[PDB]
Amino acid sequence: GFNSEIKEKYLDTLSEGMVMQMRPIFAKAEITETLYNKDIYDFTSMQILELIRSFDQTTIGSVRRTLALLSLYIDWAISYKLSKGLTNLARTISEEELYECLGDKKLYITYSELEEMENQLVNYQSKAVLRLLFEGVSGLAHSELLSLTKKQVEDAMLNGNVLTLYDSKHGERKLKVSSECLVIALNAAQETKYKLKNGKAKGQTKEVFLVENDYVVKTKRTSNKGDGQASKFVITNLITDISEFFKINFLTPNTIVRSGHLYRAYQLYKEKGVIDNSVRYQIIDDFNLRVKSKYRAVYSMQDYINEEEVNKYYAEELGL
């Protein structure tokens, strides 16, 4: 592409599979290279992030793989003193910064993405809102999530992981969830402090107090609301703080819930080869969704529960 001779020299050293991986990267990089009028090996770290973002990739995994290949090319270029500077600025990049490169095609998250994010989050309030929304504990006005108590979590733990949720408008509803979900919620329901900027605060105050109660989602004491149930704005703010840590713009209660549905669809698509209305029926049943007419909802789901989307996000898991 840009710097044809050098590129092809490096491609000669590769193993064809690697060459098939690199040809598209160099192709899509040509234009950023010609704009900056330099090769990738002289790019700065932020310029490398801008490049990878310009690839518009939908998973943190594909982003990690892309960065790795670029780092290999850069090591190569350093060894031959082609690079102006002699350090691999692609190696100085941190785990959160990669989420900047996730492009804007992305709307939904994969289960592996969820676990990685959770791992990077110091507060159990954050982990909990993410996980519980993923597994379907959202209600109308998030009533099922905001009324959730430690006792409900414990009972579920002693009940084959079946939560009895309370939506204020529609009433009671049962939901089987994972043990990870329940342990995370158990910790969240006992958390007394919340670390600002995901534990990377610069100023004098690093944490703030939460209210004293038995609810999983807890208001902050300063907010002047009661020591009882939290409002929907607490969930909005928790997700905002997460999005700011990872510098991403697609997270919404809706998209998280639907990511859960999509992951279930991926599993069933592996098991049974194709997604159809039986798969969608099964999803309605597993997440025990409130529907007036089953069939109306089955076809209403086709917009996001389909093969195009499952493949789009779960390709590598599919081995495609």
Author numbering: 1 to 320
The authors write:
MrpR has lost its recombinase function and the G136E exchange impairs its higher-order structure and DNA binding activity. MrpR functions as a master repressor of SPβ that binds to this conserved element to maintain lysogeny.
Crystals formed within one week of incubation, and we determined the structure of MrpR at a resolution of 2.9 Å by molecular replacement using the N-terminal domain (residues 1–105) of the MrpR Alphafold model and manually building the C-terminal part (residues 106–320). Two MrpR molecules were present in the crystallographic asymmetric unit. The monomers interact only weakly via residues of mainly two α-helices (helix H’ and I). As other proteins with a tyrosine recombinase fold, MrpR harbors a CB (core-binding) domain (Gly1-Lys84, helix A–D) at the N-terminus, a catalytic (CAT) domain at the C-terminus (Tyr108-Ala320, helix F–M), which are connected by a central unfolded linker (Gly85-Leu107, helix/loop E). Most of these tyrosine recombinases have been crystallized in complex with DNA to elucidate the recombination mechanisms in detail, while MrpR was crystallized in its apo form. We hypothesize that the observed organization of MrpR might be a crystallographic artifact since MrpR was not co-crystallized with DNA. The flexibility for the proposed rearrangements is provided by the approximately 22 residue-long linker present between the CB and CAT domain (labeled as helix E’ located between α-helices E and F), which is also present in Cre, XerH and Lambda Int. This structural rearrangement would also generate a positively charged groove between the CB and CAT domains of MrpR suitable for DNA interaction.
